[PDB]
Symmetry: D2
Subunit: 237 residues, 4 copies
Amino acid sequence: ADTIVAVELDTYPNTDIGDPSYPHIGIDIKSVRSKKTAKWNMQNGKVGTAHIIYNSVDKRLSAVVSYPNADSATVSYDVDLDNVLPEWVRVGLSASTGLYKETNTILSWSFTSKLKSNSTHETNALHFMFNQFSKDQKDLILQGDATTGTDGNLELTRVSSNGSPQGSSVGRALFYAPVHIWESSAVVASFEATFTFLIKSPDSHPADGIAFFISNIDSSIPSGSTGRLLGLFPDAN
Amino acid sequence: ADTIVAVELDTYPNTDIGDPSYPHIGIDIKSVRSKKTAKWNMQNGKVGTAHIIYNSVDKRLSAVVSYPNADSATVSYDVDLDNVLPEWVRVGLSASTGLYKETNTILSWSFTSKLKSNSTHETNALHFMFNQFSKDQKDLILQGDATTGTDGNLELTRVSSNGSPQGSSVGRALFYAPVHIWESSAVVASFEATFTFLIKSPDSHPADGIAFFISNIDSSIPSGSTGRLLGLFPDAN
Amino acid sequence: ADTIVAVELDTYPNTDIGDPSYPHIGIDIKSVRSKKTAKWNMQNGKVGTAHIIYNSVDKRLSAVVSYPNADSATVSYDVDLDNVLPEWVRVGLSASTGLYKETNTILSWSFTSKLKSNSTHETNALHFMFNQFSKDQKDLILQGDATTGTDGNLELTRVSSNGSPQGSSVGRALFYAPVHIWESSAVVASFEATFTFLIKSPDSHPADGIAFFISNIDSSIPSGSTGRLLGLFPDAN
Amino acid sequence: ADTIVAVELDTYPNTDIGDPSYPHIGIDIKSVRSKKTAKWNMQNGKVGTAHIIYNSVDKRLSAVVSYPNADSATVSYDVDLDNVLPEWVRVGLSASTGLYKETNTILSWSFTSKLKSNSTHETNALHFMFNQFSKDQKDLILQGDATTGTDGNLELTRVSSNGSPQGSSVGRALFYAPVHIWESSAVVASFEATFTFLIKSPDSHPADGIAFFISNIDSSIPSGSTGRLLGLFPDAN
Ligand SMILES: [Ca+2]
Ligand SMILES: [Ca+2]
Ligand SMILES: [Ca+2]
Ligand SMILES: [Ca+2]
Ligand SMILES: [Mn+2]
Ligand SMILES: [Mn+2]
Ligand SMILES: [Mn+2]
Ligand SMILES: [Mn+2]
């Protein structure tokens, strides 16, 4: 199976796989059963922003999510990612629906990774920023039901012509270039990610969520990972 | 054939294809026969730096090259790249040798592209920076004789175990992700590139040079493009 | 008198000082009588964005302005700023009203300056970005009627408690640090600026406009520079 | 007295104020008596690089120092800087000598601060980068014996015409603009700093060190802060 590290914005409480009884933000290290969660006062139909940060000195994966006019929610987990992930990874966004549903619309996504060596000329970096997405967005790898270009956005899960979200949908978008997150000469390695999202549902119970993830470069949507599995995991182990 | 835009650091004067009678910097638009050149006082065995800049408002491709303790050389050419190149491109470095030879060593390479739309949330960007190159540099596409990791550098052309440059060599490195240089909503599009290089030769007449280039995403080394053709063109037309 | 270079978004046509007979964008080199203008289809009450770019290789000051859902307007002028401005400058935003009036609200302002030398370790930079402004914004120098913090914005000219713009008002904001735009070792010097603005008026004829400017470090609002003089010039010479 | 947070590169062991018995890197929170140290294998006459990082989610101040061809040293301390420092600060470099001495030469200094709010348009930033220093470096506030421009470097402490370091010297350089490190709407605040330094001494026992610091905006060199006090503290409390 793939190797997954993710920050989930989990909109539906699945209590038999350890979700708390409310929407939540969570840190997922090789399992859908988050290592750490925090309550998330999700707002149906409002644009939110999530921020993800990490560095190899402190070895703490942290995330913050907010809406305008609202307080934030935050979660952190102590983890040495160099012991979890390979040296080269891809980074992405994933989302799913099940029998319950929502739009999983991404309006912007940015990422920066840096590796500072002990050489004289120390810095190495990758950065991207998307504030719009074209029909043919060649620097994204789209998987499953993900599409780009409708209203200039990334729709991770299927939305009908009406604009209504569909159930039983799973889709991801990965940045095309592999990312180097460890190197033998690096003295500090760091990354940051931000994305803005619009989760809308006609229903009092939206599902299933959006995640930012980091994986093996060849990651693909696991069989049967609609719904609670967020397009990330093959099972709920 | 591929579509090529390049800035050449041409170390060998080939007077029958329009080179001036000295090493020179040049702007190449779909031909090895530069549209504009300037004299370049190349220094064998010293580390130099080249800078390349462009934006879609002014439609002027400009380059500057220097060494420490030396004056610079610069060239500019008025060209609307949106009329020359496709919407999506790859960017790279190329170099060659022929019967005359040199090392074509790259010590660092950075690039930034930006597209600013008329939306509210206007900016889109790609940036990379390499200050070292690993044996397995997964975010570069290496072509021909190019290798990475010897002394942490990118060697575009073949160097023997002795450290001696070989003749009759051609190699390129392209950044893995495609780059979006035009978009229908962009109000300003720009790019900048910098690279540092070490061209060394045991000979009074080094050849053939290094170029930064922008091409169709599927570009590949043309047959027979050793020597004067810089790994860029199939002929001297 | 101060030395001023500016890009004006001139909302009121003053035909006796050379304005065209419509709102316009203009490049001002030491005079309110723009060296170059272009028609600007200003939209009362909509948020717009302006972009300003320059580099010392090409010696062309260019600007673009747009609104969402609208085409852009652009202007360019060939000028060697090293012959106009001192080595160290301050950068700012200015606006005015007269007998005619408008709000001159700034919602964001960013700037980047870079100087690349011929040394090994070549780059020098300053960047700032404001997406909000506090009541006590210590890294801005406010002049005249400019205030910060109302609805988190920079109001360059006076607005009453009602939210109604006042006439006969002039205000500027300068970034606190001086900016180094020429240096003897620089091989390329560049800058870019962006700002977003909301110009609203209850009147069919708003006035007078907003400008981004670059000046001597000790610049101050000239006496009598309300109205057509944009807080920038002492007279219409 | 001023309020100081600093990362020290302490070259001389003063065992009665808690220094370990070797050169060390340390985190100083309102006292010269570091809260945390780590052994630092300082190399007389070689160029080193220090990196400092912090964010308000994790509340951990961390630093790494290295030389080419050498292993790094690192230190971290859990501290909420919003409880230590004011909302607006200045950032700087300081160094000292005493009866023992060294050069305290800075070859480059960069800094980035970011404040991400919960608004739509979330990011606010300041960045600077110096890779050279001019005789008249207007965006630095020089204190005590600090000078700029000799060999294009920042000499924090006095060096004679011979190039020999002097004893009993203290000097600092602060960036001119104040820096906003907390804001009521910020959901994440972060900073990073890097500097490269050359500490040389004709003596087997160099002293006293270099620090990166963050202070109240009006900070000044305390009386009698030569030597062990690093230009930072008025006493060894
Ligand atoms: Ca769930
Ligand atoms: Ca040639
Ligand atoms: Ca006017
Ligand atoms: Ca000490
Ligand atoms: Mn969950
Ligand atoms: Mn040529
Ligand atoms: Mn005008
Ligand atoms: Mn100490």
